Amino acid sequence: ATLTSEVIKANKGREGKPMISLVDGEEIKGTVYLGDGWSAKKDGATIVISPAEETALFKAKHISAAHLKIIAKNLL
Numbered sequence: 001a002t003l004t005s006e007v008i009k010a011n012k013g014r015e016g017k018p019m020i021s022l023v024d025g026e027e028i029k030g031t032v033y034l035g036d037g038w039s040a041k042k043d044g045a046t047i048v049i050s051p052a053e054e055t056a057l058f059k060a061k062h063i064s065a066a067h068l069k070i071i072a073k074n075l076l
Contacts, residue, residue: 007036007052013061017074032074 010022011033019031032038033051040049040063047063054060063071 001053001055003037004053004055004058007033008058012051016063016067016071030074032071034075 006022010020011018016032017029019028019034020026021028021035033049036052038049038051039053040047045065047065047068048060049063050058050060
């Protein structure tokens with residue numbers, strides 16, 4: 001699959017807030033890895049999330065608990 005390589009390349013560690021869909025190249029301020037394959041879990045005091053996916057050929061992404069607060073603001 002190219003979803004994992006294609007989506008991560010679009011944005012990686014750039015203050016999750018602005019998301020561009022290379023599908024039609026457009027700025028979507030108010031989305032965070034949404035509409036791609038966002039997946040995460042709560043570890044308690046530190047969230048673990050992979051932008052679009054993770055197949056051993058890529059890596060996870062950290063998120064401070066406070067940063068998790070920013071993601072909710074982005075969607076709504």
